[PDB]
Amino acid sequence: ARSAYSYIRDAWENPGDGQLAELQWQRQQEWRNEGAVERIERPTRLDKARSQGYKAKQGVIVARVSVRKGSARKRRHKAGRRSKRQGVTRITRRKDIQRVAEERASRTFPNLRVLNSYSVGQDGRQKWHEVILIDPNHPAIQNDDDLSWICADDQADRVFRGLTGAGRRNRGLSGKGKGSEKTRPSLRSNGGKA
Amino acid sequence: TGAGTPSQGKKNTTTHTKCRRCGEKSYHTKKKVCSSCGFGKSAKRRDYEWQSKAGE
Amino acid sequence: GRRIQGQRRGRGTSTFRAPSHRYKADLEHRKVEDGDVIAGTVVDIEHDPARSAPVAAVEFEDGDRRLILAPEGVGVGDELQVGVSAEIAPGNTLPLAEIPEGVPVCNVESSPGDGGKFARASGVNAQLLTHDRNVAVVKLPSGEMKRLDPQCRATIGVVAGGGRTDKPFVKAGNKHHKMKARGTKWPNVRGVAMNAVDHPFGGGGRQHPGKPKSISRNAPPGRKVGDIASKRTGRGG
Amino acid sequence: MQMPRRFNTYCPHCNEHQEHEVEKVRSGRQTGMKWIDRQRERNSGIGNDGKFSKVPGGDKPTKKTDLKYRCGECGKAHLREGWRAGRLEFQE
RNA sequence: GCUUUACUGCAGGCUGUCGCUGAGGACUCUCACUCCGGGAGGAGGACACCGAUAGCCGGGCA
RNA sequence: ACUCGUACGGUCACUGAAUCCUGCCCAGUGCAGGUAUCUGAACACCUCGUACAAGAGGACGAAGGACCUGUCAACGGCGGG
RNA sequence: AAACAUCUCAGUAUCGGGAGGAACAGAAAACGCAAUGUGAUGUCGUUAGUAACCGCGAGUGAACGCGAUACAGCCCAAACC
Numbered sequence: 001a002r003s004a005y006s007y008i009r010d011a012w013e014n015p016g017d018g019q020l021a022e023l024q025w026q027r028q029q030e031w032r033n034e035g036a037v038e039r040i041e042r043p044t045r046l047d048k049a050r051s052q053g054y055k056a057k058q059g060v061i062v063a064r065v066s067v068r069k070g071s072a073r074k075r076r077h078k079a080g081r082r083s084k085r086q087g088v089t090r091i092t093r094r095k096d097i098q099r100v101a102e103e104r105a106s107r108t109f110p111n112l113r114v115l116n117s118y119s120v121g122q123d124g125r126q127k128w129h130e131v132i133l134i135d136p137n138h139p140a141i142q143n144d145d146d147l148s149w150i151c152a153d154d155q156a157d158r159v160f161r162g163l164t165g166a167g168r169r170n171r172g173l174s175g176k177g178k179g180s181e182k183t184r185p186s187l188r189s190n191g192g193k194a
Numbered sequence: 195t196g197a198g199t200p201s202q203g204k205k206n207t208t209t210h211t212k213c214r215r216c217g218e219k220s221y222h223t224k225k226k227v228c229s230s231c232g233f234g235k236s237a238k239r240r241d242y243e244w245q246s247k248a249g250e
Numbered sequence: 251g252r253r254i255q256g257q258r259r260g261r262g263t264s265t266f267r268a269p270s271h272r273y274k275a276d277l278e279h280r281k282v283e284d285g286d287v288i289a290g291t292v293v294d295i296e297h298d299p300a301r302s303a304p305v306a307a308v309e310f311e312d313g314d315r316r317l318i319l320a321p322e323g324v325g326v327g328d329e330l331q332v333g334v335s336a337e338i339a340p341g342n343t344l345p346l347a348e349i350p351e352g353v354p355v356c357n358v359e360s361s362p363g364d365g366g367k368f369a370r371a372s373g374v375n376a377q378l379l380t381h382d383r384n385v386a387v388v389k390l391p392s393g394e395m396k397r398l399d400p401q402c403r404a405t406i407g408v409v410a411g412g413g414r415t416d417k418p419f420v421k422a423g424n425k426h427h428k429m430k431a432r433g434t435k436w437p438n439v440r441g442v443a444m445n446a447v448d449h450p451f452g453g454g455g456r457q458h459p460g461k462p463k464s465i466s467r468n469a470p471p472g473r474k475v476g477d478i479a480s481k482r483t484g485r486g487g
Numbered sequence: 488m489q490m491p492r493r494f495n496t497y498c499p500h501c502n503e504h505q506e507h508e509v510e511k512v513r514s515g516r517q518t519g520m521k522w523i524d525r526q527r528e529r530n531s532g533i534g535n536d537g538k539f540s541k542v543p544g545g546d547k548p549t550k551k552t553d554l555k556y557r558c559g560e561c562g563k564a565h566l567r568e569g570w571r572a573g574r575l576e577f578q579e
Numbered sequence: 580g581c582u583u584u585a586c587u588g589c590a591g592g593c594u595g596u597c598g599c600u601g602a603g604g605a606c607u608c609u610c611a612c613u614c615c616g617g618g619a620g621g622a623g624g625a626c627a628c629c630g631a632u633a634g635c636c637g638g639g640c641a
Numbered sequence: 642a643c644u645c646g647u648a649c650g651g652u653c654a655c656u657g658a659a660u661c662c663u664g665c666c667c668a669g670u671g672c673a674g675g676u677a678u679c680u681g682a683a684c685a686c687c688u689c690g691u692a693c694a695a696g697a698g699g700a701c702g703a704a705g706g707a708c709c710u711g712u713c714a715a716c717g718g719c720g721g722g
Numbered sequence: 723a724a725a726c727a728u729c730u731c732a733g734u735a736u737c738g739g740g741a742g743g744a745a746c747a748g749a750a751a752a753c754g755c756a757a758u759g760u761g762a763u764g765u766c767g768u769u770a771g772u773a774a775c776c777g778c779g780a781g782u783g784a785a786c787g788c789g790a791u792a793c794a795g796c797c798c799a800a801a802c803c
């Protein structure tokens with residue numbers, strides 16, 4: 001039979017309809033008064049959290065992070081530039097807001113490593129995402145057959161190297177076939193062409 | 195007044211001094227910053243790629 | 251070109267800032283719970299370095315010692331009151347509602363409790379004209395009819411120091427000393443006296459502006475100079 | 488110059504002389520879907536747009552003839568080399 | 580380097596549209612949002628701000 | 642930033658003490674105001690088109706412009722016969 | 723590019739952040755020698771200056787496959803407990 005989780009999932013398919021709508025209208029009001037990074041005891045989207053690797057366990061942390069909406073906050077050129085490079089308004093960044101949110105969170109918890117993250121909505125001027133972080137030093141996790149992998153040295157600062165889920169996706173690594181000539185095994189080895 | 199020799203005489207102000215961190219005489223005692231190692235501005239040591247030829 | 255003077259200003263560098271550290275007080279109306287029982291005695295009359303006009307030192311019953319925007323006709327010993335049921339005389343502060351029409355008023359608030367914004371410079375005063383339950387028309391010194399919340403507190407009388415503008419500075423030195431106490435770069439070099447690089451009116455073999463002086467409102471900073479969005483110019487007509 | 492609306496001449500399709508009707512080629516309308524239309528959309532961006540930033544050229548003092556020769560029997564038209572003419576008016 | 584009704588563009592300003600954004604071609608309201616007020620609370624209010632796009636002006640700048 | 646500021650303010654410009662004065666011109670340019678009508682982008686809406694789409698047309702029409710007015714101690718002008 | 727604006731120099735120089743002894747990638751919502759076919763990923767050789775791009779100017783520029791190197795394949799979320 002349907003899991004209880006399946007209802008959270010189905011509910012969030014339309015954050016602007018039903019109960020979820022009234023819930024967001026309320027929640028966001030408190031969220032706008034909270035800080036950039038806010039640790040929370042429980043994930044707003046349990047299905048998503050658990051689906052992404054979450055476990056109600058010691059060493060597993062969640063935090064909501066808000067980033068401003070829109071294009072790049074870019075400074076205009078202060079020296080000679082050909083017309084092609086004189087833009088300001090239409091320039092957008094190459095990392096998505098979700099990815100920026102993951103970084104802001106990971107920096108807030110220097111000792112933790114970003115496991116994954118998900119969207120929790122957005123109002124007119126900002127978007128919120130809840131990041132799942134892990135204490136690679138806690139024995140509860142060091143002994144977890146499902147998460148201990150994050151405890152490896154080579155996973156250090158994983159979010160800053162784009163090794164995250166949103167990272168790999170934003171790096172054009174989804175497709176294994178056509179279209180990924182310039183992305184795999186890395187953007188940098190492909191001369192930075194995507 | 196000439197900007198040359200005659201303007202050199204007023205120069206009795208101390209600025210760059212021996213750096214507690216790098217040992218170089220570049221610690222600007224008024225800014226409290228080392229122009230050589232960045233001590234006072236950066237936890238990381240001052241270093242730029244333009245300090246050497248691009249392919250080296 | 252280089253940034254014009256109006257642009258340098260924005261940066262808020264030393265030269266453009268006001269000597270705040272020398273300023274005396276941020277003259278604002280008192281915050282009374284209600285009732286209006288609040289009153290105090292004029293202890294002294296001081297010179298306000300920020301407005302070139304007198305400011306009255308007052309001591310309140312509750313111990314509070316604070317300077318105030320002194321209207322004309324206030325001296326040491328006088329008792330000033332502040333509140334809804336305050337008396338209707340010079341130096342006292344009460345909402346426009348409790349103020350009889352036709353009576354000159356100064357240091358008027360824009361939003362009740364903001365401490366007063368309108369008519370605060372030498373000699374000026376507003377003019378309470380019309381009453382209501384919702385609006386209280388007040389004629390500001392510029393001659394504009396300002397519709398205001400009857401709850402907006404204000405002070406009875408004309409601001410002290412009237413007639414300051416009557417005597418000429420006569421000499422540059424006198425201007426120098428005044429300017430030195432405000433957030434203003436002085437003296438002033440005419441645009442038309444600069445180089446093309448420095449100001450839109452600069453350049454030429456003789457002094458005159460390049461284009462016409464009246465500039466569109468939409469003009470960008472660096473160009474908005476001369477007669478800003480003038481509806482007309484000159485005296486004739 | 489004056490030009491007859493209809494007259495006998497060789498018909499390349501029919502392969503035999505027949506009465507033809509002369510018409511000034513009316514400009515057909517653009518779809519805006521040809522490859523060039525897409526390249527305009529694609530290649531235009533921030534700053535100058537290269538070839539797409541160019542404006543129309545001038546005019547020649549006199550234009551050549553842009554005619555259509557309509558065959559009377561088979562009804563199929565054919566084109567010919569035009570020739571410089573200030574104005575061209577048809578007779579009947 | 581400088582100028583402009585040189586070419587081409589870029590900021591910026593004005594303007595429409597979309598999102599935030601809700602109840603009942605002109606109108607009411609409050610609950611988001613904004614501001615005032617220490618607060619109770621008041622003013623404003625689906626506009627404004629912010630994000631996006633479109634037209635205009637645009638040697639301020641390249 | 643201006644601003645511990647509030648039009649007797651402060652910003653942006655021109656002229657450059659006092660004294661006698663400062664004429665005529667709003668066509669062009671600028672700025673500002675108005676505007677029946679004309680012009681005026683995109684979204685949404687209608688039509689055609691396409692089992693969808695590209696695309697073509699239409700209706701509505703903001704600022705802006707046409708048009709009208711104001712203004713020269715705005716840019717400037719003050720001749721020939 | 724014998725000027726120059728798209729293009730080119732070049733995602734180069736330089737800048738911000740960070741890992742390891744190597745990094746990254748990686749067990750198909752693949753390929754598409756279209757098959758009765760291949761079978762994670764890097765890399766080397768080739769495919770090829772080919773296809774594709776481009777004031778269709780100057781210039782720019784892959785991949786599938788093939789031959790090699792080394793080979794390795796697994797764990798959750800949920801269902802039911």
Ligand SMILES: [Cl-]
Nearest residue numbers: 113114158159
């Ligand atoms: Cl991390």
Ligand SMILES: [Cl-]
Nearest residue numbers: 425428429432
């Ligand atoms: Cl002054």
Ligand SMILES: [Cl-]
Nearest residue numbers: 511552553575
């Ligand atoms: Cl013809």
Ligand SMILES: [Cl-]
Nearest residue numbers: 755759760787
């Ligand atoms: Cl194959």
Ligand SMILES: [K+]
Nearest residue numbers: 081082730731
């Ligand atoms: K170039």
Ligand SMILES: [Mg+2]
Nearest residue numbers: 185186189746
């Ligand atoms: Mg590599």
Ligand SMILES: [Mg+2]
Nearest residue numbers: 196197198201
């Ligand atoms: Mg010198």
Ligand SMILES: [Mg+2]
Nearest residue numbers: 276277278645
């Ligand atoms: Mg104040």
Ligand SMILES: [Mg+2]
Nearest residue numbers: 415417418419
């Ligand atoms: Mg004066």
Ligand SMILES: [Mg+2]
Nearest residue numbers: 265430432434
């Ligand atoms: Mg000063």
Ligand SMILES: [Mg+2]
Nearest residue numbers: 437438439440
């Ligand atoms: Mg001067």
Ligand SMILES: [Mg+2]
Nearest residue numbers: 443444445453
């Ligand atoms: Mg000079």
Ligand SMILES: [Mg+2]
Nearest residue numbers: 251446449450
């Ligand atoms: Mg200039």
Ligand SMILES: [Mg+2]
Nearest residue numbers: 456457458656
């Ligand atoms: Mg002169």
Ligand SMILES: [Mg+2]
Nearest residue numbers: 442457458459
């Ligand atoms: Mg002059």
Ligand SMILES: [Mg+2]
Nearest residue numbers: 532533534536
């Ligand atoms: Mg363009």
